[PDB]
Structure formats: structure tokens, C-alpha cells
Scaffold this active site. Structure first.
Site, PDB file in Angstrom:
ATOM      1  N   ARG A   1      35.008  61.348  42.436  1.00  0.00           N
ATOM      2  CA  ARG A   1      34.329  60.042  42.624  1.00  0.00           C
ATOM      3  C   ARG A   1      34.689  59.479  43.978  1.00  0.00           C
ATOM      4  O   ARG A   1      35.880  59.362  44.285  1.00  0.00           O
ATOM      5  CB  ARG A   1      34.757  59.085  41.534  1.00  0.00           C
ATOM      6  CG  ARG A   1      34.359  57.616  41.801  1.00  0.00           C
ATOM      7  CD  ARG A   1      34.700  56.777  40.603  1.00  0.00           C
ATOM      8  NE  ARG A   1      33.835  57.023  39.460  1.00  0.00           N
ATOM      9  CZ  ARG A   1      34.154  56.731  38.193  1.00  0.00           C
ATOM     10  NH1 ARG A   1      35.378  56.285  37.860  1.00  0.00           N
ATOM     11  NH2 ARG A   1      33.257  56.925  37.225  1.00  0.00           N
TER      12      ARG A   1
ATOM     13  N   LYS B   1      31.144  54.433  52.649  1.00  0.00           N
ATOM     14  CA  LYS B   1      31.138  54.156  54.105  1.00  0.00           C
ATOM     15  C   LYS B   1      32.412  54.638  54.774  1.00  0.00           C
ATOM     16  O   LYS B   1      32.374  55.372  55.767  1.00  0.00           O
ATOM     17  CB  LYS B   1      30.887  52.671  54.403  1.00  0.00           C
ATOM     18  CG  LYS B   1      30.734  52.434  55.923  1.00  0.00           C
ATOM     19  CD  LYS B   1      29.906  51.223  56.276  1.00  0.00           C
ATOM     20  CE  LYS B   1      30.576  49.965  55.865  1.00  0.00           C
ATOM     21  NZ  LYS B   1      29.713  48.808  56.218  1.00  0.00           N
TER      22      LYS B   1
ATOM     23  N   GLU C   1      41.279  65.440  54.416  1.00  0.00           N
ATOM     24  CA  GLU C   1      41.577  66.771  54.940  1.00  0.00           C
ATOM     25  C   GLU C   1      40.450  67.757  54.706  1.00  0.00           C
ATOM     26  O   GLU C   1      40.120  68.543  55.600  1.00  0.00           O
ATOM     27  CB  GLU C   1      42.919  67.263  54.411  1.00  0.00           C
ATOM     28  CG  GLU C   1      44.128  66.421  54.839  1.00  0.00           C
ATOM     29  CD  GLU C   1      45.444  67.032  54.361  1.00  0.00           C
ATOM     30  OE1 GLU C   1      45.641  67.209  53.144  1.00  0.00           O
ATOM     31  OE2 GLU C   1      46.255  67.360  55.262  1.00  0.00           O
TER      32      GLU C   1
END
Ligand SMILES: Cc1cc2nc3c(=O)[nH]c(=O)nc-3n(C[C@H](O)[C@H](O)[C@H](O)COP(=O)(O)OP(=O)(O)OC[C@H]3O[C@@H](n4cnc5c(N)ncnc54)[C@H](O)[C@@H]3O)c2cc1C
Ligand SMILES: Nc1ccn([C@@H]2O[C@H](COP(=O)(O)OP(=O)(O)OC[C@H]3Oc4nc5nc(N)nc(O)c5nc4C(S)=C3S)[C@@H](O)[C@H]2O)c(=O)n1
Ligand code: SF4
Ligand code: MOS
Ligand code: FES
Ligand code: FES
Ligand SMILES: [Cl-]
Ligand SMILES: [Cl-]
Ligand SMILES: [Cl-]
Ligand SMILES: [Cl-]
Ligand SMILES: [Cl-]
Ligand SMILES: [Cl-]
Ligand SMILES: [Cl-]
Ligand SMILES: [Cl-]
Ligand SMILES: [Cl-]
Ligand SMILES: [Cl-]
Ligand SMILES: [Cl-]
Ligand SMILES: [Cl-]
Lengths: 175, 731, 316
Positions: free
Chosen positions: B615, B620, B692
Site C-alpha cells: 500500500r 506524491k 531503495e
């Protein structure tokens, strides 16, 4: 050698964000370090101290420059505008607001520089100054994405917010 | 709260605030030059002195003497700190190289002294006068030269073998055997490392730039040999880190030592030219990949070995791990080989191990797909594994790599690629299209928070979690707002201070999920306390619109705190779901590049990342992370390299001009799509890491696009024009 | 950075006189190279004389029909000037190809000519460098030399001159105008201005002690198609790997000069004369004396291919 000379101290008048400042400075002091350490205007950042990053960009008599590579004493009586002079949280500059809306920053450390440059870049275009990507050198440049990317390339963002920075600048330029 | 069963329905599922692309709540401070970084806390020490670092002039040897009389006599100088006068020090558990050298020099630019003076300029000038003399010793600086001699794994890291790799490789219908290299890389975070120290008797306060507040506190205390309780660490704003600020560095130690010696606050910044050799770097790698497939294109044999080097006791670059999990294959071998190199300390940089591992593996897969005659997207789909290949009863918690690749191919227009390399021009530019997979595990660590419902209806969140530009301020505000039914703008969030509860920090891309989960835990207790204050059962109560409701009855959050503020402090801890399932994150990266047919200059034209990272908490700020990682991957692919001088034993191009990172003009259109990958095995938030993952696979997608543009495979990164020029078309 | 006294004066003559009167004095213009080097104590002047605001910042037509460019004209202003864009376009192109807007805003005409090398061993005062310390050795020769020179080199130094502007100036037959402390004036053709490294790579230019550059003079416009092609690993804000400055006429004759290959802008009249014969011919003449390292050998092929691309652009 076995010694290094004592500071040479000189009086200096600067107009910083509209305000007359009267200082005594070591001649070695850069405009960057005068803003940060002497005047406590910490919004202008130091990313490298050698002209490589743009994080120290300010405006001197309207023109953007890297404050780490000019001496305070070279600007006696000049009008300096820093990020703090453009706006504050309860009175944001349209470019500050655009950066927020488009998320044109992450860590925030290059952002003072990006914003000061952005405002100057739009003006440089309005003034008819060409760039490396201007195809027709004799005619007036247009405010295009390509022009903006080239003209902002002296402001490095290691977070990599560039695409959003461009979106913020284009939004601000359209208004 | 102990998370040991997959999450069911809970308040976060409402997604009234979580999952929404809210503006960063630190935006007004960061765009107005009012967020304070470590070197900017003037009111807290208005007469702070300045410390200027002296770094080793040699790579390796002995400091025969370190004389400081001339520096001591220089204008404005207060003291000079050295190993010799600092007293016996400890060493933190996350420092391989000592942070203060002498009498032994372990690497070039290792800190050996600090001059403290009244002004910055006086400190800098005095530092030139520190007289260091040395006896060089022989060192090992070339990973390539060391490779031949390292043919066994580290004692604690044995090779992993499944089935019969050698036999299967021999039997395979189609196969590749290729070697790849990645160079040493540097974080180049735009804020130089810096710290300010103030002592009040035996209590230390350190303002610093650090990703991991609790590790900093413990490590600084151990190094100084002081009680951990006597140290307070403060880092509310960090100008980037990318792994480089996970650990205690020389600025923090030296600030602390200096301020205690001169009985006055001292601030220390590492000058940019000292950073690349003084601090850490991603280790270079040398990787050998042997992959075989059957007549249908099913991989049957996969071998991945990687060599990297470090100072004695340092970490390897874990470049083979992804190869254990990413693709199917019954016969597998992986292994690390660790050389000893006397270069600066190798350590974490964004996606340690996976970034360079995928830089190799995802070219090798492109090579194998080409040899097999199979589209490289289809080839990866064919070789998907929904289980751990070494333990096929162990399921991934969920895995949507196939869907990343299919969605990406469709959006990007992958079918419009010419599969014969070198056949597409746009003016003088050769155009190419490339793809690669990304992969990064999801890791869980204990994390806590304190949440207060104030008498005016606002909510206060405190945790030592950091915001390094990731968005933690915002997503923690969103979490609390969601849980308590209050508007986002009524939540205050205070971060990065060891006076707050211990979070997992910013690292391993576990930060968002773990920090928000601890806020979840604190908020569930706070909801109980609110419910109890108004006389409702919390099991049946709902929180929305500044009210609490329970069946037929209603009350306002205002009423619950008429008695005074309500405070909850809790942590989340994680049980064995990460052993029961493999929890990972996936991406598909699609790139279009142009290669100048004359000069060989490489310019990226379009990038798409499709990610599955649980999720998404704020699309943004999550998108920012991925475009940011896309940019850092462009760097890695096309321009970034610390040039090793293997005679002088250091990184030569050690500044922000010599080590080249991408600039505005380099940046193409960058698109990101997040699949709904809600993962209840992960946590109550159902989120997984992204910061990452975003980097993983990017550089190889660019390399593969360059191949598609030119027909030239380049297996030693970065892919610069001098590696292409003599195989381009005629002008 | 060593402390220095700082001096403002009223005229150019006062500046030159003061530089003679004060051992170790240097002029400061934009500061964008000098301050970089002073921070590192690579340059250690005892005294700075500010030469901004002395009237040395005009762009004027000359009586002979060329252009007189003040030493203290800002690089942005020089690139933006209507006459430069129209009649000396290759100079505008070269300026705009370099550095960043912030740096071009402050950099000046004479300062740009006098910028020093970007060699990383020169910049790191812990490393061997003959340019910085005569006889200490040249770390680049057998070290990291990808960015270094391929022609005009010596065993003592393989550094390049980094300026883009200087390449266009050389193409345009620019003349450096000076005043000496004695108060006389000199003209030095840019082609005679940069010294070869030889066994003395610490000696870089023809300026005498305290000599002040006041202007650069250009001859009348050449017409033709002006091109400045700069090759670099990243798209902006980087110095040239190789650059090609060209002015190509309708018949295919013209002139060329190169950056990124030598201790100065690299141009040979005999090579200019072969432009109509193509890039291979021009290359052979230009690089007959080349002596690359293994790491920078690619610049030779790059120069040839870039020249080919430039001539194809002019034909199109
Ligand atoms: C990171 C970065 C990247 C760059 N990229 C480019 C690039 O792509 N291309 C390129 O061309 N440039 C590049 N530059 C270099 C820049 O163009 C030069 O630093 C600049 O042109 C110097 O001009 P200045 O006026 O600042 O000189 P200064 O720094 O003020 O002075 C330079 C030297 O000139 C002497 N001097 C000054 N004016 C006079 C005068 N009138 N007479 C006699 N002596 C004088 C000074 O004493 C000093 O020795 C880069 C700069 C940095 C920092
Ligand atoms: N499911 C998810 C996961 C993440 N996020 C978004 O992504 C950020 C990153 O969360 P996460 O992936 O958990 O990363 P961490 O909080 O653990 O931060 C560390 C991470 O952050 C990364 N991105 C960085 N970006 C910035 N600007 N600067 C750094 O130093 C960076 N360092 C890299 C490195 S290295 C690592 S390990 C969130 O704050 C949030 O904005 C989201 O909305 N939903
Ligand atoms: S090349 Fe010229 S500048 Fe670079 S190191 Fe050798 S001498 Fe010092
Ligand atoms: O795990 Mo990120 O700080 S290398
Ligand atoms: S701090 Fe001035 S350019 Fe980097
Ligand atoms: S915002 Fe972190 S460097 Fe641009
Ligand atoms: Cl002295
Ligand atoms: Cl402006
Ligand atoms: Cl929203
Ligand atoms: Cl609810
Ligand atoms: Cl959305
Ligand atoms: Cl969005
Ligand atoms: Cl630097
Ligand atoms: Cl370099
Ligand atoms: Cl999306
Ligand atoms: Cl010599
Ligand atoms: Cl000539
Ligand atoms: Cl050719």
C-alpha cells in the site's frame, strides 16, 4: 610555512532583503558565509563551497550568482536577495507555492538555490538572454522545458526532484 | 503491539488521509529557507566556535608525528584536537575505520586532527599549519588485482547451493557466461556532513545530520566512553543521506571532543572535497554470472559470484542475494568473495547489494533472452517464481513482478521496439529501448511513538524517526489523522530527537512502514483511552470528523480531553511472518535512450517505472522517491565513478565537479505507476518499502537500451562514450 | 585561505601600479576561479586588487570594423550582446556551452582566458604535480588521465586548458590588450598567449608581473556558418572532453579550433586550409604530433568524428 596572517577586517554595508546591514568582516569572508554566519540568514546553503552545486545561489542587484565564489567586500552597497527575501511560510512567493504543489524538493537542501535560480531564469529569458539550447541565436528565446532545464543545470539536486522542479517552474511561468 | 498474524480490516483501510497525495507538511519550511540543518542552529549556541578537519595525506602507513604548535599560535585558534590529546576512545559497532586516526593511518583523508578557532576562516587557515609527517606502508588498492587470490567466501557467509548447478549448466540448451563490473560510488548528499556539540557538565547535546538517531546516540556514547543516558542527539532535517549518514562519522565525534576540550560549543562540517575519501562509498564489484535455460527458455541453472573489497572487518557488497529469489531455476549457486583493500571504508549506499547485483544480473538476463530468441519481458514472465527457489514451500507474501512488467510494457509501448539493434534513428541519434526488473526485500524492525490528543483537539506525534527527504513527517501525520479522525492540518509531528521514542530510523527501506506502524500502535492505545474517557467500548467505537461514535451514541474529541491531554506511547514489534513468507518488493523499468551516432554521447529520452511496494502511503512523495531513484540510476549507468589511483590508493575525482551526478539537462520525461500491492503480511499499514526499490534495475534498463540502440554490450559501468565510440556507424 | 588586504582603486592604471608596488598582489574579477584556488591555498596572494567597476566592461565597435571587448565584461553579457550573436556567433555559442548561469554571470573576459587547469591532482595539494610544485612529478601521466591532453604535451605535464570561450577567441584571431605597470600598452595575439608546459608547466602565459588585461579585440566579422560542438559525458555543467569550434563558408572552406585536447586552444592554419577535403585530412594535420595516454587515446577518434559531424552539419 610556520605562520598564517591575521584577519584583515573591513567595514561593509550590504542591503539584504531590503534592510541596510553594517558589518565588520574578515576580507576572506564569502557572501555566503556573511549571510549564514554573520547575519544568521541560514536559508542560503553551502553544498560544496567551490561553485559546483548552486545551493548557495542568491541574487545580487537582480542577477543570480553563487555566493560561495564571491567576497562580501566585493559587494559594498549592493542589493542582495536571498530565499528569505522572496517569501516566508505565512506569505509564500508564487514559486515557493509552486514547489510545494509539485513536490519540487525532497531533502530541501538544494531548494533555496533552485527557487532563487528559477526566479532569475524566467527573468533572463524575458531579457532575451540565449542559452546552449537556443537554436536561433539572433531571435528571442521562448520559455520551453528544454530552455528551463539547461538554464537550471547549475543547481544540482542529489535527491533527483528535477522533473517536479521543472513542473513547478512551468506552472509558475504560466501565471 | 505484537504483529504476528496477517492484518485484517482496520482503520487505515478507510484511506481518508493515508494513500492520498498530500503536500509535504515540511514544505513551507523547506521552500522558505527556514528549516534548520545541523550547522544552522545559531540560537542554541550563539558563540559556537568552528572546527576544521585535517585529513590524512596518505592512504596507508604510520603518522610518525603530528605537530600542532604553529596551528595553536595561529590567529583566533582555541585548541587543536588529536588522537594523542583526545584520550582513549571506544569504537562504535558500525564504524570499521576509526573516526580519528593516529598513530595508524587506515585510509586517505582519515581525520587526524581538528583545529578549533573563533571564526571559520581562521580555523581553515590554521588547519594548513598542522604538521603531519608519515611513513607509507604497502597497500592493496585494486579489486581486480586482488580477485585471483580470493576464491573462498567469508567464514560467516557460506556459498548457497541448490540442486546441481554444474551439471545443469552443461545440459542447458542455451546459456551465457559473462563478467560485469561496477565502480566505487559516492553518496554526494547535498548537505555536507555536519554537527554541533554543546556540553553542560557531563551531558552532551549533538545537533547533527544522521539517518539513525538511536544508533548515533549509542555509537557516539561508546566512542566517547560516556553513559548513553548523558547524550541527546538532534537531527530534525537532513539534507540527504542515501546510506552515507546511517552511521556516526568524523564530524560528530570531533565536534563532541572539541566542545568538551574548549568548554564552549563547537560546530564542524566536513568540507565537500574531503567527503568522498573521508566517509564511505559503495564498494566496486566484479561479478561472474553463468545462466542456462532449456529449449523452452526456462532457466535451469543460475550461478552468481561477486567480488568486492574493504578494510579488514568491513562489509561485502551483497550483490548475489537477489539472484537467490528473483528468477526460477532448480540448480543454483551464489557466493560472495571479499578482498582486503586499503581504500576508504566501503559501506551502504542506496540499495546495497541489489543496486550493483541487478546492474549485472539484468544485463545477463537480456543477453540470455536474446540468445534464446525470446522477448526480454516475456523471458522474465516465463521465469517468474512465486516461491523461494531454495525452499519451495515458502511463498512470497505477494509478488506482482509479472504485472509490473506487463503494465509497463503496455504503457511504454514496448511492442514498438525494434528487436534488431541499431536500426532506429532520430536525426543523428540512435534510439533504443531497454527493460529490466527491480527487486528489494521488505524488512521489519521494532518502532515506537508517542501520540497526544491535546485539549484544543489537535494531535501531537513524537518519534525519533528521521525525514531525510523521504516524507516521513507527512506520512506520520497522515497515519495519525486517519486513526483519530482529524484533518491532516491538525496533526503536529516532531522527529529526529533522542528525547522521543525509539523508531527503526531511515534505512533498509523499512522506515515508512515501521515508523507508521508504531504510530498505528500508539493511536490504537490512544483510541482506547479516548473511548474510556467518554465511557464507550473501544471495540465498537468509530473515529471521524473530530468525534467518537458507538452505535447510537456520540461524543466529541474536545470532551475527552476536558480532563487534560491524553497521551499514548507504544511500539510495534514483529514476529515470524518474515520467516514464514518471503516479503519483497518488485519493479519493471522501461527506458528509451539516444546515443549520438558520431560522438557516442548517451542521453536518456524517456523513463517509466512500474512498482509494487505494498500500500502506498502518499503517492506524491512515493513518486518523488522513485523519480529520484531513477535519476540516481541514470547516474550509475552513465556517469558516476570514483576513479581509483591504485598507486596512491585513493579516489581521485573527489568533489562535486569531478564525480559527476545528473543535472537538470540530463533528465527526461519520468513516469511512475504504483500497482495496488496491499500486503497484510507486512504490517497493520499493509505497506512495504519503496525508497531503495526505485533504484533497483534502473541502470541495467539503461544499459540494455544502449545495447538496443547501438548493438554494443558494455559490461563495465558507467557506460560512457569512450566505451562505444569505435563500434558506432561511419560519419 | 590566507588572509589578504583588499584594495579598491579609481582607474586601471592605479590597479596596475598597485600590483607592481605590492609583492604577491593579484587582481580579482569574477572570483570564480581565483577564489576556488585560494580556498585550497593553491593561490596565496597577500593582496587583492578589485578590477571591477573601472570602466573595463564595455563592448564597442572598433574603427577597423571589429569589436573591442572589455576585460571585465561578464560572460553572460558577452554571449547575449546583439553584435556578438549576429556577427561573432561562435563566441556566443562557446560561452553558453560552459559552466552555469550563476558562474557565467560573474565570470569575465580576461578571467576566463586566465582560468587554470581542472586536473584533479593539481587541485589536491597532497599529490605530485609539477605545475604546482616544479619537479614533484606529474601524477596524471601514469594515473587518471581520461580528461587530460593528447597533443602539445610534455613529459612534465599533460594538463588541458579548460576554457570554451578561449577556443572561439583563438578561432577569431582575438588579440589580448594590456597595460603594464610601467604604463605602456601591449597587444598579444591569443595564438601567442599560452606557453607550452615543456619543463616549466608552472609558467602558463605571456603576462608579465602585474600586467593587467584591459580588453580583447576582435577583427571584422567573417560571415559563414558558426558552430561550437562540445562533447561531454553529461548534458550540461561539465567541461569539454573535446570541443570543435568552426566557421564554415558556402564553398566549404573555413577554420577550426579545438578544446579538450591541449594546454591551449588547438588550431593549425595548414589544417584549416584542408576543410574542403574532409575530416580525415584535417585530423591528420591537427594531430600529427599527438602523444596520448592509454586513458585518453579515445579523444583522437572523438575529435575526428566530432569534426566529421560538424562539417556534415555545415553541409546540411
Ligand atoms: C564548477 C565550474 C564549472 C565550470 N565550467 C566551465 C566550462 O564548462 N567552461 C569554461 O570555459 N569555464 C568553466 N568554468 C570556469 C569559469 O568560466 C572561469 O572560472 C571564469 O571564466 C574565470 O573568470 P573570473 O572573472 O571569475 O576570473 P577570476 O577568478 O576573478 O580570476 C582568474 C585569474 O585571472 C586573473 N585576472 C582577472 N582579471 C584580470 C585582468 N583583467 N588582468 C590580468 N589578470 C586578471 C586573476 O588574478 C586570476 O589569476 C567553471 C567554473 C566552475 C566553478
Ligand atoms: N509504501 C510506501 C513506502 C514509502 N512511501 C514513501 O517513500 C518514503 C520512503 O519510505 P521507505 O521506502 O520506507 O524508506 P525509508 O523511510 O526507510 O527511508 C530510507 C531510504 O530512503 C531512500 N530515499 C531517500 N530519498 C531522499 N530524498 N534522501 C535520502 O537520503 C534517501 N535515502 C534512500 C535510502 S539509502 C534509503 S534506505 C516515504 O517517506 C513515503 O514518502 C509511501 O508513501 N508508501
Ligand atoms: S598534468 Fe600538469 S597539472 Fe595535472 S598533475 Fe601532471 S603537472 Fe600537475
Ligand atoms: O539502507 Mo539506505 O540508508 S543504503
Ligand atoms: S556552495 Fe556554492 S556552488 Fe556549491
Ligand atoms: S532536494 Fe535534496 S538535494 Fe535537491
Ligand atoms: Cl604571517
Ligand atoms: Cl531576478
Ligand atoms: Cl489530497
Ligand atoms: Cl474507525
Ligand atoms: Cl493518486
Ligand atoms: Cl501524484
Ligand atoms: Cl567541491
Ligand atoms: Cl576529474
Ligand atoms: Cl499510480
Ligand atoms: Cl618540471
Ligand atoms: Cl593558425
Ligand atoms: Cl569520421
Amino acid at each position: 610555512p610556520a605562520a598564517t596572517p591575521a584577519p584583515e577586517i573591513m567595514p561593509l554595508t550590504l542591503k539584504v532583503n531590503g534592510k541596510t546591514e553594517q558589518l565588520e568582516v574578515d576580507t576572506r569572508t564569502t557572501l555566503l558565509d556573511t549571510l549564514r554566519e554573520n547575519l544568521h540568514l541560514i536559508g542560503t546553503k553551502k553544498g560544496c563551497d567551490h561553485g559546483q552545486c548552486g545551493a548557495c545561489t542568491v541574487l545580487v542587484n537582480g542577477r543570480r550568482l553563487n555566493a560561495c565564489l564571491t567576497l562580501a567586500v566585493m559587494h559594498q552597497g549592493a542589493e542582495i536577495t536571498t530565499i528569505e527575501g522572496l517569501g516566508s511560510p505565512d506569505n509564500l512567493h508564487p514559486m515557493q507555492a509552486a514547489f510545494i504543489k509539485h513536490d519540487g524538493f525532497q531533502c530541501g537542501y538544494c531548494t533555496s538555490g533552485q527557487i532563487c535560480s528559477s526566479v532569475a531564469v524566467l527573468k533572463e529569458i524575458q531579457d532575451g538572454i540565449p542559452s546552449h539550447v537556443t537554436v536561433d541565436l539572433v531571435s528571442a528565446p521562448e520559455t520551453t522545458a528544454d530552455e528551463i532545464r539547461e538554464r537550471m543545470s547549475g543547481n544540482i539536486c542529489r535527491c533527483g526532484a528535477y522533473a517536479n522542479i521543472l513542473a513547478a517552474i512551468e506552472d509558475a511561468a504560466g501565471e | 503491539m505484537k504483529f504476528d498474524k496477517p492484518a485484517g480490516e482496520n482503520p487505515i483501510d478507510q484511506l481518508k488521509v493515508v494513500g492520498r497525495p498530500h503536500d509535504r507538511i515540511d514544505g513551507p519550511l523547506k521552500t522558505t529557507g527556514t528549516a534548520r540543518y545541523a550547522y544552522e542552529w545559531h540560537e542554541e549556541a550563539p558563540n559556537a566556535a568552528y572546527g576544521y578537519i585535517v585529513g590524512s595525506a596518505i592512504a596507508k602507513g604510520r603518522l610518525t608525528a603530528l605537530d600542532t604548535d604553529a596551528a595553536q599560535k595561529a590567529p583566533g585558534v582555541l585548541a587543536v584536537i588529536t588522537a594523542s590529546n583526545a584520550g582513549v576512545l571506544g569504537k562504535g559497532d558500525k564504524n570499521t575505520a576509526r573516526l580519528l586516526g593516529g598513530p595508524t593511518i587506515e585510509h586517505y583523508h582519515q581525520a587526524i586532527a581538528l583545529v578549533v578557532a573563533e571564526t571559520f576562516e581562521q580555523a581553515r587557515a590554521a588547519a594548513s599549519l598542522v604538521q603531519a609527517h608519515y611513513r607509507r606502508n604497502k597497500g592493496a588498492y585494486s579489486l581486480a588485482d586482488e580477485k585471483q587470490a580470493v576464491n573462498q567466501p567469508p567464514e560467516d557467509t557460506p556459498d548457497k547451493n541448490v540442486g546441481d548447478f554444474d551439471g545443469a549448466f552443461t545440459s542447458a540448451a542455451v546459456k551465457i557466461d559473462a563478467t560485469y563490473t561496477t565502480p566505487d560510488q559516492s553518496h554526494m548528499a547535498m548537505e555536507p556532513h555536519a554537527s554541533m556539540a554543546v556540553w553542560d557538565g557531563n551531558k552532551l547535546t549533538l545537533w547533527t545530520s544522521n539517518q539513525m538517531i538511536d544508533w548515533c546516540r549509542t555509537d557516539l556514547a561508546k566512542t566517547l566512553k560516556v553513559p548513553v543516558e548523558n547524550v541527546r542527539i538532534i537531527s530534525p532535517y537532513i539534507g540527504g543521506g542515501f546510506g552515507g549518514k546511517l552511521f556516526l562519522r568524523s564530524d560528530a565525534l570531533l565536534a563532541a571532543l572539541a566542545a568538551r576540550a574548549v568548554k564552549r560549543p563547537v560546530k564542524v562540517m566536513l568540507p565537500r572535497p574531503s567527503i568522498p575519501n573521508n566517509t564511505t562509498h559503495r564498494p566496486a564489484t566484479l561479478q561472474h554470472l553463468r545462466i542456462g535455460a532449456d529449449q523452452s527458455g526456462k532457466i535451469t541453472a543460475i550461478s552468481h559470484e561477486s567480488w568486492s573489497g574493504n578494510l579488514p572487518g568491513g562489509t561485502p557488497e551483497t550483490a548475489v542475494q537477489q539472484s537467490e529469489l528473483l528468477y526460477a531455476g532448480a540448480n543454483r549457486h551464489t557466493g560472495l568473495r571479499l578482498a582486503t583493500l586499503d581504500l576508504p571504508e566501503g559501506n551502504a549506499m542506496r540499495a546495497p547489494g541489489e543496486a550493483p547485483g541487478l546492474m549485472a544480473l539484468e544485463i545477463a538476463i537480456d543477453e540470455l533472452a536474446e540468445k534464446a530468441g525470446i522477448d526480454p519481458v516475456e523471458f522474465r514472465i516465463l521465469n517468474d517464481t512465486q516461491v523461494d527457489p531454495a525452499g519451495p514451500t515458502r511463498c512470497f507474501s505477494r509478488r506482482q513482478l509479472i504485472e509490473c512488467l506487463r503494465t509497463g510494457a503496455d504503457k511504454f509501448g514496448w511492442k514498438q521496439r525494434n528487436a534488431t539493434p541499431g536500426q532506429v534513428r532520430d536525426g543523428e541519434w540512435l534510439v533504443g529501448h531497454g527493460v529490466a526488473a527491480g527487486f528489494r526485500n521488505n524488512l521489519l524492525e521494532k518502532s515506537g511513538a508517542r501520540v497526544h490528543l491535546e485539549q484544543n483537539g489537535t494531535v501531537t506525534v513524537e518519534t525519533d524517526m528521521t525525514d531525510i527527504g523521504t516524507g516521513s513527517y507527512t506520512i506520520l501525520a497522515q497515519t495519525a489523522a486517519e486513526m483519530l479522525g482529524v484533518p491532516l492540518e491538525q496533526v503536529a509531528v516532531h522527529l529526529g530527537d533522542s528525547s522521543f521514542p525509539v523508531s527503526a530510523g531511515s534505512g533498509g527501506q523499512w522506515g515508512a512502514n515501521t515508523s507508521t506502524s508504531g504510530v498505528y500502535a500508539a493511536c490504537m492505545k490512544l483510541r482506547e483511552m479516548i473511548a474510556s474517557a467518554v465511557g464507550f467500548d473501544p471495540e465498537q467505537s468509530q473515529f471521524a470528523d473530530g468525534k467518537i461514535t458507538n452505535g447510537t451514541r456520540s461524543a466529541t474529541l474536545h470532551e475527552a480531553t476536558a480532563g487534560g491531554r491524553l497521551t499514548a506511547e507504544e511500539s510495534i514489534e514483529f514476529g515470524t511472518l518474515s520467516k514464514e513468507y518471503q516479503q519483497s518488493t518488485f519493479a519493471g523499468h522501461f527506458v528509451e535512450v539516444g546515443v549520438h551516432s558520431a560522438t557516442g554521447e548517451v542521453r536518456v529520452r524517456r523513463m517509466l517505472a512500474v512498482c509494487a511496494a505494498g500500500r502506498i502511503l502518499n503517492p506524491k512523495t512515493a513518486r518523488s522517491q522513485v523519480i529520484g531513484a531513477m535519476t540516481m540510476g541514470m547516474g550509475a549507468a552513465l556517469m558516476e565513478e570514483l576513479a581509483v589511483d591504485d598507486r596512491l590508493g585513493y579516489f581521485v575525482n573527489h568533489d562535486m565537479a569531478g564525480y559527476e551526478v545528473p543535472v537538470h539537462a540530463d533528465i527526461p520525461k519520468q513516469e511512475v505507476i504504483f500497482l495496488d500491492d496491499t500486503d497484510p503480511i507486512s504490517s497493520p499499514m499493509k505497506a512495504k518499502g519503496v525508497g531503495e526499490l526505485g533504484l533497483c534495475g534502473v541502470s541495467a534498463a539503461i544499459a540494455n537500451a544502449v545495447y538496443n540502440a547501438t548493438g554494443i554490450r558494455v559490461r563495465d559501468y558507467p557506460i560512457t562514450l569512450d566505451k562505444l565510440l569505435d563500434k558506432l556507424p561511419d560519419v | 585561505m590566507k588572509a589578504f588586504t583588499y584594495e579598491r582603486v579609481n582607474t586601471p592604471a592605479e590597479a596596475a601600479l598597485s600590483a607592481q608596488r605590492v609583492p604577491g598582489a593579484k587582481f580579482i574579477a569574477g572570483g570564480t576561479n581565483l577564489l576556488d584556488l585560494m580556498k585550497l591555498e593553491i593561490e596565496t596572494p597577500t593582496h587583492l586588487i578589485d578590477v571591477n567597476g573601472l570602466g573595463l566592461d564595455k563592448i564597442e565597435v572598433t574603427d577597423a570594423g571589429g569589436l573591442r571587448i572589455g576585460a571585465l565584461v561578464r560572460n553572460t553579457d558577452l554571449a547575449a550582446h546583439e553584435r556578438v550573436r549576429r556577427d561573432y556567433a561562435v563566441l556566443s555559442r562557446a560561452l553558453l556551452a560552459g559552466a552555469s548561469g550563476q558562474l557565467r554571470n560573474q565570470a569575465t573576459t580576461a578571467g576566463n582566458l586566465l582560468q587554470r587547469t581542472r586536473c584533479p591532482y593539481f587541485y589536491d595539494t597532497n599529490q605530485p604535480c609539477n605545475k604546482r610544485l616544479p619537479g614533484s612529478g606529474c601524477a596524471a601521466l601514469e594515473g587518471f588521465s581520461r580528461q587530460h591532453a593528447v597533443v602539445g604535451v610534455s613529459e612534465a605535464c599533460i594538463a588541458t586548458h579548460p576554457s570554451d570561450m578561449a577556443v572561439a577567441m583563438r578561432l577569431l584571431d582575438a588579440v589580448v590588450e594590456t597595460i603594464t605597470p610601467e604604463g605602456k600598452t601591449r597587444s598579444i595575439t591569443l595564438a601567442d598567449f599560452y606557453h607550452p608546459p615543456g619543463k616549466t608547466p608552472h609558467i602558463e602565459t605571456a603576462l608579465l608581473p602585474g600586467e593587467l588585461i584591459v580588453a580583447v579585440t576582435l577583427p571584422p566579422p567573417l560571415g559563414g556558418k558558426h558552430i561550437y560542438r562540445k562533447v561531454r559525458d553529461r548534458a550540461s555543467y561539465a567541461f569539454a572532453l573535446v570541443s570543435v569550434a568552426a566557421i564554415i563558408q558556402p564553398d566549404g572552406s573555413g577554420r577550426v579550433a579545438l578544446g579538450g585536447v591541449a594546454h591551449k586552444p588547438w588550431r593549425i592554419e595548414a589544417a584549416d586550409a584542408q576543410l574542403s577535403q574532409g575530416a580525415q585530412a584535417v585530423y591528420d594535420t591537427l594531430f600529427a604530433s599527438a602523444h596520448p595516454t592509454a586513458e585518453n587515446t579515445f579523444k583522437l577518434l572523438l575529435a575526428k568524428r566530432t569534426l566529421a559531424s560538424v562539417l556534415a552539419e555545415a553541409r546540411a
